[PDB]
Amino acid sequence: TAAPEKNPVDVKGEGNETTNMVITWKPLRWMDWNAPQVQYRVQWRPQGTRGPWQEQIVSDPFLVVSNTSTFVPYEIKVQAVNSQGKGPEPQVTIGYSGEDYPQAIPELEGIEILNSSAVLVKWRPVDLAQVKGHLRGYNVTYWREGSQRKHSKRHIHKDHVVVPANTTSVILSGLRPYSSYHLEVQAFNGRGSGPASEFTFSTPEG
Numbered sequence: 001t002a003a004p005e006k007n008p009v010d011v012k013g014e015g016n017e018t019t020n021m022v023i024t025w026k027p028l029r030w031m032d033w034n035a036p037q038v039q040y041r042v043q044w045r046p047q048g049t050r051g052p053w054q055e056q057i058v059s060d061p062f063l064v065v066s067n068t069s070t071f072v073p074y075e076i077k078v079q080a081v082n083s084q085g086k087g088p089e090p091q092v093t094i095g096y097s098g099e100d101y102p103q104a105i106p107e108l109e110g111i112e113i114l115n116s117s118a119v120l121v122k123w124r125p126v127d128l129a130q131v132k133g134h135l136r137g138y139n140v141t142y143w144r145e146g147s148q149r150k151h152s153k154r155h156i157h158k159d160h161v162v163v164p165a166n167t168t169s170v171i172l173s174g175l176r177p178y179s180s181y182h183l184e185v186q187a188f189n190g191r192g193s194g195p196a197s198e199f200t201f202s203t204p205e206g
């Protein structure tokens, strides 16, 4: 019997609620314990504030951190410990509290009319500090004038395009010539989508 051989890997820090941050790691292989029982030394503090480290020694491979702010980064260290001592100093990982709906509305750059049937919608990248999460993509919902209206579960179908978070334009084809479209653009993360910006445009006679 001796100190633990290695510290855990696969440290992660992600909450399911904007008031918590679940921390997790990979339980150590028993060959790495060097004793018949092993605990995990878990130190954490926000990144930015850098006060004292909060600390807690639990035996399960996870620790629920509560009473947090919405989506804020924490420094995280996990260190195996037993009767004989501690493992090497842990390596520092970063992890965030829960995600929340986005505050950023997307600002227009220009809407370029290509055909009687296609248009290139170009918005600006959103301020990440307003996303309150990991920016996952952008959400572009467009619909036609809407003249007929005889159905419900699927009336005047509002089509939409999903693009990654690092493309700041999209082409929208398949349009009807000489029509009026509305248009909404949203950022989204894991939680949800932010408020939509509103725009209209018109297709040529074709």
Ligand SMILES: *[C@@H]1O[C@H](CO)[C@@H](O)[C@H](O)[C@H]1NC(C)=O
Pocket (backbone or CB within 6 Å): 016, 017, 022, 062, 064
């Ligand atoms: C969040 O995850 C923890 C497990 O770490 C669980 O106990 C809790 O019930 C979860 N809450 C929600 C709302 O999913």
Ligand SMILES: *[C@@H]1O[C@H](CO)[C@@H](O)[C@H](O)[C@H]1NC(C)=O
Pocket (backbone or CB within 6 Å): 067, 068, 069
């Ligand atoms: C909860 O968190 C706030 C800061 O986020 C802190 O000021 C307050 O004292 C905390 N309370 C407890 C019981 O941890």
Ligand SMILES: *[C@@H]1O[C@H](CO)[C@@H](O)[C@H](O)[C@H]1NC(C)=O
Pocket (backbone or CB within 6 Å): 114, 115, 117, 118, 171, 173
């Ligand atoms: C409409 O414009 C798009 C631009 O991407 C192009 O793919 C398509 O060929 C055009 N259609 C016609 C009929 O010009």
Ligand SMILES: *[C@@H]1O[C@H](CO)[C@@H](O)[C@H](O)[C@H]1NC(C)=O
Pocket (backbone or CB within 6 Å): 139, 141, 158, 159, 160, 162, 186, 188, 193
């Ligand atoms: C916005 O995207 C979300 C998920 O990405 C989903 O509710 C939907 O596809 C989009 N919104 C609309 C109104 O289509």
Ligand SMILES: *[C@@H]1O[C@H](CO)[C@@H](O)[C@H](O)[C@H]1NC(C)=O
Pocket (backbone or CB within 6 Å): 165, 166
């Ligand atoms: C999008 O770009 C940012 C920085 O510009 C980057 O950190 C992020 O990982 C990118 N998204 C994906 C899915 O790789």
